Symmetry: C2
């Protein structure tokens, strides 16, 4: 299936594209809201600025894809493979991404003139794998990363305020200038550097973690 | 013996056994009292500014309101002394001048309301000492034993407590945000308060 047809079928009103092969398709600025594209194959597909609001996308292959600036509001993406995808500036506000793969992925990018972060406000990221992902300046305000894997995640200038990070793995995570005000870090595994860098005014922490915060400032015990 | 109000400026009185004396308001400015037995002596409101007092046994002495600004007390036995309202330090327009209290034994001593601005208590023993509402602005309190001490209401802006030992002491949250504490030894309950002092919820 190619471009001139998948648009023709969307122009007719088809919403059932599940398991349909769509590798490397050119869909820049294409509007495809609501469409069931679950289990489909979008390996390396170009979806820059593609309006994909509330599209079913569970288990879909999206690795090494271009989704920068793409509207992904309320899209269901649980277990979808997004390894190495480009989401710099994309809006995934409130998307379901539980048990989804986001390793090596590009969510943020610092340019000389400023930082552009993808909007993940109140999004769901339970058991998600963002290991080695770059979330520079990414807006995760109010998101949920319960038990999520953030091993070696780049969180410079990220707004993780009001975030649920319980049972998360923030080891090797770069957290300079990261806002974690009123976050839930209970049970998470963070390096000592996080206690000295991320703003934690209001962060819910464990008794074990509070001491680690103190020991991270050179207090002997 | 009584020797109250006497004027011994720049006087050399080293090693003198002046125990149980009555030096109420005695001007002992710059008076060399090195290694002087002064235990249980009444020195309240006396002028001891600039006076050398190295290793002077001053235990149980009453120094309430005395002026020890710039005085040398390097290693004086002041355990269980009374030093309330004392002038141990002063911030002048050109700078702060504080008394040397290096390695001084202040065990169970009472410094309630004493002004220790810029005072050097490097490595001093202050076990169980009372520092209620004590002015510790820019005081050097490094390696100082502060076990079981009470620092409630104390002003600690710019105080250095690096390598100190605060285990057991009762301090206000403001201390955790104002004093340097690199290498300090604290409790589990204290280390949690240090985190609560910076805004973490439990």
């Amino acid at each position: 299936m190619n471009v001139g047809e998948i648009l023709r079928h969307y122009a007719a009103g088809k919403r059932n594209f599940q398991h349909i092969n769509l590798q490397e398709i050119e869909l820049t600025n294409a509007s495809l809201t609501g469409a069931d594209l679950s289990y489909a194959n979008l390996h390396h597909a170009n979806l820059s600025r593609a309006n994909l609001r509330s599209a079913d996308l569970r288990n879909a292959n999206l690795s090494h894809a271009n989704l920068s600036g793409a509207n992904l509001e309320e899209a269901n993406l649980e277990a979808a493979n997004l390894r190495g995808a480009n989401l710099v500036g994309a809006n995934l506000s409130g998307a379901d991404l539980q048990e989804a793969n986001l390793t090596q992925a590009m969510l943020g990018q610092t340019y000389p003139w400023g930082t552009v972060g993808a909007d993940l406000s109140d999004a769901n990221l339970e058991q998600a794998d963002l290991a080695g992902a770059q979330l520079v300046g990414a807006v995760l305000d109010g998101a949920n990363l319960h038990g999520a894997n953030l091993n070696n995640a780049n969180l410079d200038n990220a707004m993780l305020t009001r975030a649920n990070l319980e049972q998360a793995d923030l080891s090797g995570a770069r957290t300079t200038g990261a806002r974690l005000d009123d976050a839930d870090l209970r049970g998470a595994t963070v390096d000592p550097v996080l206690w000295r860098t991320a703003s934690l005014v209001g962060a819910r922490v464990d008794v074990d973690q509070a001491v680690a915060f103190a020991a991270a400032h050179g207090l002997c015990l």
